[PDB]
Amino acid sequence: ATLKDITRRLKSIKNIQKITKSMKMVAAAKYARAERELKPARVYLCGAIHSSVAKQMKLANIIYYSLKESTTSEQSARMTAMDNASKNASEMIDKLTLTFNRTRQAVITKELIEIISGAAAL
Amino acid sequence: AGVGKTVLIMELINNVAKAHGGYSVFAGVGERTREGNDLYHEMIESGVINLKDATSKVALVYGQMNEPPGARARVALTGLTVAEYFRDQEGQDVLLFIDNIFRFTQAGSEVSALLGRIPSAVGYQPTLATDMGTMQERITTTKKGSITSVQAIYVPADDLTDPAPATTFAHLDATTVLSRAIAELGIYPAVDPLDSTSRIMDPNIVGSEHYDVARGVQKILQDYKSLQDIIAILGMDELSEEDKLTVSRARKIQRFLSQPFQVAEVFTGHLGKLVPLKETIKGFQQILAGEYDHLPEQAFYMVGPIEEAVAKADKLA
Amino acid sequence: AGVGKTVLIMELINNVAKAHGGYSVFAGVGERTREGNDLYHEMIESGVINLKDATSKVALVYGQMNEPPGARARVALTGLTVAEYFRDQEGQDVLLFIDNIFRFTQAGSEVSALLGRIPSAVGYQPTLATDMGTMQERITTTKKGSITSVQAIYVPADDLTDPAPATTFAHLDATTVLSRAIAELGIYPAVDPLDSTSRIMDPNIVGSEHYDVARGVQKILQDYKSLQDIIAILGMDELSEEDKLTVSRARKIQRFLSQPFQVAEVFTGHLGKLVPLKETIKGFQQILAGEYDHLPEQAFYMVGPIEEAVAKADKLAE
Amino acid sequence: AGVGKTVLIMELINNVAKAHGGYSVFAGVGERTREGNDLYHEMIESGVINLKDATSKVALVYGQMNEPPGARARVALTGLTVAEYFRDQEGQDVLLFIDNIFRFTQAGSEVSALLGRIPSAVGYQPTLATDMGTMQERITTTKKGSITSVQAIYVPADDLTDPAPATTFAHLDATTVLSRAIAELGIYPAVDPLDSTSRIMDPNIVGSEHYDVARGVQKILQDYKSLQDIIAILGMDELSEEDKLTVSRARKIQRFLSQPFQVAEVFTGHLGKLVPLKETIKGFQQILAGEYDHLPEQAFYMVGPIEEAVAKADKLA
Amino acid sequence: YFRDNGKHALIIYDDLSKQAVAYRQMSLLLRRPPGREAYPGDVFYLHSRLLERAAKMNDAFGGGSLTALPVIETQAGDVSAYIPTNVISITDGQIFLETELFYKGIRPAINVGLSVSRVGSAAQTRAMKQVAGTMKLELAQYREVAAFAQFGSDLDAATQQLLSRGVRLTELLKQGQYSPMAIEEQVAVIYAGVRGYLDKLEPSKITKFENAFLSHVISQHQALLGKIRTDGKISEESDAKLKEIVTNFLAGFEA
Amino acid sequence: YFRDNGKHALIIYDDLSKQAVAYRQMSLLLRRPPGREAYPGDVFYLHSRLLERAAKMNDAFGGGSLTALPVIETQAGDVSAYIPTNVISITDGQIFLETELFYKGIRPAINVGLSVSRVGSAAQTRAM
Amino acid sequence: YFRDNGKHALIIYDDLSKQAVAYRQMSLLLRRPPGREAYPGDVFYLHSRLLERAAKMNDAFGGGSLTALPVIETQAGDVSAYIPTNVISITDGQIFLETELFYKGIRPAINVGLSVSRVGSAAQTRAM
């Protein structure tokens, strides 16, 4: 890993941390507005949840009952999946920012010791 | 730059002279000539320098950027000497400002290089730590007095681990971080109350009460910061009666941390306050109990003691 | 190393030097001897060099990779001397090709220590920039006559910030920057559309249509560049309708930038195409407007004019 | 530093030397003296050293972290010469255990500096590799007799491209590269499965059953490796039904590539294990085939043969 | 000479980088001990001493002034390299130009969020300082949300407005080469975007509008501009005329 | 003195990192070819010869002991740098301290998962 | 000898990475100031001299040929490295191998994007 490699990786992951942080909010607005509307209906990339019902698979009165149990489950899980993705990206920023500084320092030292070798040998 | 650095320096001088009868020295280590002149005239203005008589509380030692590395590596030493007379002859508590410490290291690095010495890690001088040590070790409490130093820290490539900052942090007993976000949100002085820490912040040194109160303030502001995510996007009308208490209490504490300075008198209009240690501790301790739970938020902003928080909460009938 | 410099200088000779009314000078400076013999016999066949009569139009100078540094440090000065006379004591139109001009810097730095100098940064001789200065400033159009100079520049360790190439930029009116990242995808020529500049990229000079389409291409390619790393993790579908449309167009523009060369036939398997100016501007104008968003991207890969891309898409029906 | 070179070499001594007919030499090069005292007394207690008899099986040569550089620069040659005799002038079989051979190269830098040469890269001696050569080429099997050498190689700052370790690869028939990152996952021995090679890994020498399984394991471990960027951000929840499967298998294989050592019993408390080659193949053959897809990962962690993992799944309530 | 004799000068060093390289050549060939990047320990002393000669004189010494615009070429965005690090530390401020900005459309390619003037406010005319302050805060707020512009359809009311204001002002900051504007001409066009007149106009049309709008106010409203300059800010009278010129022009534009 | 005359001593080197920099200063003023972080080839030897003198003697030599607790200050958890990896590969174990744990209020701030002291296990009381 | 006598020879240099190291040593001991990465300023000339001697001869010189396959060892799969790019810049192309491809089953582990032939189809039969 060089500085070019790292700063490129840093900026992109810093961006993934941003989009994911806003998608945490968007899902939180959709989740709350859906959990407030499961109450009267009670008595009548979102992670594993899209596979959970698709793997378990392998009129008008009940069709609605499930369709408001879905949005509470989905916009909730998306809030959870994305709360992770941004926090994982945050940990990856903190880690890569540290690698970048070590590497910056090392390179400066290296490139300087090479100049010194050439001057003393004369 | 931007946040009230100079004002804080000019206030420290003014406040230390009034409370502890000690003078101040300011050392400009590779300072820009434009910013040097600007400080001179700004210091005349705030009254810490008097052209007419002899009430000036600061001395000025200047080593401008356009001077050879020798000159700029010695200016911290010229200022240290002036500061030392006030401690070792008049028995005062001297306040020494170095602006800034990186340029002291920078200058040493160059002298070294010019002397043919082999550079060290990251291009610094091999005498880096001793260059620092020989200078930084004269700034101490003797039995005849003390020199206390506030040094401006520049961090290269925003890297704390960089040899220049890294070395300095060995001699540091406190950090005062002037925050950017806190300045535009009105709060002055713009001191970040969570980045700023102290070594003498320990119950055995400053008393059990001083420790317990300020650790309570820190806890309340730290708990406030985490609650902000639940507040900003979800909604305030969710949290229980025990959480609403902590939100308003901490917000009132934030306001009480702001202060009208004596040097910012001919700029903001408000009168400047110098709050003693006892009144500082008791006020924040009182807010933590719930004694001022009834009072409005905008009372503690820009006041002296907690008594001025009463007069301002009355004037808004 | 190995991204297309020579192939490109070869195609330009094919496209410009063959037509050119006047004299040309080719300097082989510290490159492959094989290439020189390849060049010699291609020019004899095409007639640009005639051994029998005296209607010859090219002068050749060679000091290749098999020579000691001193020969390599000077052959560039020999070439441009042949080019200097034709500029002044003939006053005519002169073309000057140098492959590779890096090998005059490298050479100079091969003997620097044995000359008693402390090395400057990255190993180079402390006189890098002035050696360059006193050499390059001779390669120029004066009032006495004209020189069109094409110079291949090797970029050591694939680093454009390397003293040698970095100091070469200031000596140039137009820059074509090849890229390995682009070559490894199969895009030839691997010109970087976001790092190649020219002094006459100005509406006042090339017209507003030429300039607006040009900047339009770069704009979409920069947009797609800044989505690249984000869409790879978050998935394609999470993109808005405006974006996944600039992704399709930019990817198609990316391929329409690639072109088969009359000289690279032994590499591509494709008959070389040369696309005139007005057919280029209009073609790219069209992809940007949206006129080909129903075509598969592989229609635009390795073709000539925009008409050929439609023909290719038609053939991909079966 | 601290990955398990010495624990590896001690387990190897226990597992190969005791059960071979012939002599062994141990050279201690630039290492811990206490480790020498540890080895000596434990060899006395087991009876491979006999202070009264003539049946001693091991020659010891030591030149450790306390010796001048010259001494450490040559110790490797001394233990080597002891091993040279036993190979030739007996018509016999020798084992040679050196720990640590890096210190030879390292000791070369120290004297090279005072010999006043122009250093090569990283500060190292310009003679680095010829030094290493004239030394390494004597540690070899000949027509006259064989040396099985197991040398421990220290890696400066985990950089396998550092001249010292980088040049050592050319001199080996097998490389067991230990990985810090693997150790932090709690996997021992921390052998890097995708970075460890042997010249005997040939379908004509080990047979195709051994070759096909080995290669197949390296394939699934490589495929998992490129899946670890996507996981690192989004998690395993954003994976296909195909990729999820290779991951579960690769994680089961990663852990089954770990086993407790006899020389580790002292601190683990768990009995050490010795797995016959045919059982290692059968075990990994089965995980790949898909025969243990219902079992959990943690069932493959720190066991011997594949049977023991099956029994560990029952044990998990 | 100008600074000293009551006059005002502006010097451009293009560039100081090559001057440094040149000094390194001499330093090394004189066997002076090499340092970081092969530069001698007094390469800072070389630039620092030059750039501190630029100054604003008081009335007693003539009242003159010298302003320096030094140019530094970074290598792959490395502002931390020796010489960049030096001259950055000497100057009173920096204008950062960036490649990905340049090709995205932003020309000139100034990174508004990173560039600084420590002198700043104390050298703008009262009129500029009014619209500039509003633009500063509106763009900064924009920069926070900019990432969720292309990845957000379920945006709330308050942020959707911020994005729109942002891209608008961003376009207003774009400018052609070899066509500098008078300070009043400048505030006039920023005024349009700042007061939200271009909020409904399509972002791809802002360049066409500004060119036509500016051409118009220069043609007919020579007095309105003269007021913005002389009045020493945007007056109540000036606020009214602008509100009318824009609205009617804007309707006429979109027809 | 205590080690050899039947007694037991404990030495604390606070810290060995700063001794390394002093020695780097010495080595660079002496013009000795720098390696990683400009340290001279023999920084390892500098600490190894020292830290080896801490030992437990048998009864035949008085039964004494010297115990060494050398301190190494890392930058931002970089227990992978030159001087840290040297001292690790010289001493018998490590007590690891993290900024992370200190802040939370785990005081003392020991990582009890990374820390090791394999030779101290035999020398632990049965009660413990 | 084969090349100049109407015969056809193929030479393999395994590997030119090590010869450069030998050259580096030889140069530094001859007290010739180090250049880039500690190698002599002329490491390019070292290999350029040698590989330019691999050639195809016309019929007046006997029609012979010497073909060369130099071997270079990369560090951590980095072809963009200074020494690798020096040799790549001499030869008529490169076969590039990657440990990642090797372990995935792609054997030979040829990276197609990064490997090229500079003679191309001219070196193939019509059938190929």
Ligand SMILES: Nc1ncnc2c1ncn2[C@@H]1O[C@H](COP(=O)(O)OP(=O)(O)O)[C@@H](O)[C@H]1O
């Ligand atoms: N195979 C193993 N099983 C369990 N722990 C191990 C094993 N190998 C190494 N370790 C851990 O690593 C530590 C260091 O071991 P050691 O071999 O002395 O490191 P080094 O590679 O420097 O020789 C041990 O104290 C132990 O905690």
Ligand SMILES: Nc1ncnc2c1ncn2[C@@H]1O[C@H](COP(=O)(O)OP(=O)(O)O)[C@@H](O)[C@H]1O
């Ligand atoms: N224009 C192109 N079209 C197809 N293939 C190309 C093209 N340019 C280069 N190549 C391929 O890549 C190789 C490298 O090109 P070359 O000009 O020899 O590189 P350089 O001179 O920059 O070192 C060529 O041998 C050829 O196979």
Ligand SMILES: [Mg+2]
């Ligand atoms: Mg070429």
Ligand SMILES: [Mg+2]
């Ligand atoms: Mg060990």
